[PDB]
Design a protein around this nucleic acid. Sequence first.
DNA 1: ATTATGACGCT
DNA 2: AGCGTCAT
Length: 430
Amino acid sequence: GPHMATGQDRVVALVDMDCFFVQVEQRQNPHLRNKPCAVVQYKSWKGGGIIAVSYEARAFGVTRSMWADDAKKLCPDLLLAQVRESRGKANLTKYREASVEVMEIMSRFAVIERASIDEAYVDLTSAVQERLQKLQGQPISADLLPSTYIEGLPQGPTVQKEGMRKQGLFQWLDSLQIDNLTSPDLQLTVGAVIVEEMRAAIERETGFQCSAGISHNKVLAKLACGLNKPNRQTLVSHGSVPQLFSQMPIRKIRSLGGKLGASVIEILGIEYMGELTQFTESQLQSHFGEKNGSWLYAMCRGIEHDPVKPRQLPKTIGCSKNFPGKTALATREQVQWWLLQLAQELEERLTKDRNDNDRVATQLVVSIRVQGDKRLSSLRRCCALTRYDAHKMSHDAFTVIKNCNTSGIQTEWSPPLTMLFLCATKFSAS
DNA sequence: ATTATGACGCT
DNA sequence: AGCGTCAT
Ligand SMILES: Nc1ncnc2c1ncn2[C@H]1C[C@H](O)[C@@H](COP(=O)(O)OP(=O)(O)OP(=O)(O)O)O1
Ligand SMILES: [Ca+2]
Ligand code: NA
């Protein structure tokens, strides 16, 4: 009743760039704009592996993880941009730098949590309160929400997409009580107005388009963002949750896309998020653990409390390379040469990071995979990172892994290594 | 022969 | 610590 929390205390948005690496390449090369195109890494093996796909190319069935040679079978006119290669490996610097451009703009509007290279959460609770004060009971015009969808509308008693969007928006605005500064639906709407402004600023100042979700927590905001892509934003209200969740496969909710989600489905014999409401909190904790059970109990009701953490910079800086099949490293010289290549890229990134961000990494983590192991990482060891020097880092990395060598011969390496990974961690202010 | 990342949970 | 899960 009156004491039942409804998880409507915050306004949270998730902003996510559309086909990000493709946009970065299209900005740089106008010949790729408005074309089916994709970004690929490496080229020798099957034309390279696709890592990003324009919406025009998606229409042909082109997807991430596809080999470009195979993508060309679906889309003969597909255009390709290659990830830069430095020191024998893919170098993602251009995309990281583009990400900083966007994150810096978002940070003008509110505190952000960097969630990935091209997405960030925003806690808009305070900004909304402020904007509500300026508005002073004044209604919100549809003109302020030119790219916003209201999930679940229109409903009740045009055949074009944009017509539908406007009908839903009108029904929503018609029902708003702008007289109540504490109305959660009103707070969400003002949140959406701010996100329109943020998205406009990103596009004006970078050229990049994005989508966004606006809701009361991170999980719903993330789910919302994907409902209308590309170049649109979606508002998911508390009230929209029962219908939305009633046919929402469990795997669509962030964190349920893997083994836990599969177990929820198997153990409970359900398919959709909404079906979770029929279990008690203790029942859910019994199957999935205290933490997961409480989380599920609240989440299936649209409630989640994970905060938007104030963190704009990555917490680790890493460099990794696979050596698949016949390329696996089988000699000590090979292993040392590649550790050096990685260490050199890492040094470059670390030095730039120290200058830009006034911090220093203090731990170096070294990870490898051995041929045969189904696991992505086979072994992880740490050592001290006391100097930003690639030769030292690579020597140190070799020292911590060298005993993994089964080979009786000093010069040979067995079993061959199929992955090397160096990661700088544990930053301290400097 | 997906690859290159990056955050967080468990013990 | 070192490993696993989940994600982009
Ligand atoms: N599995 C991956 N391997 C390598 N790079 C990836 C992978 N997934 C995503 N990326 C990179 C390239 C993407 O452009 C960027 C952002 O990813 P993501 O948001 O999932 O898709 P996207 O921005 O390309 O398309 P969308 O418009 O669907 O969001 O990160
Ligand atoms: Ca994206
Ligand atoms: Na993303």
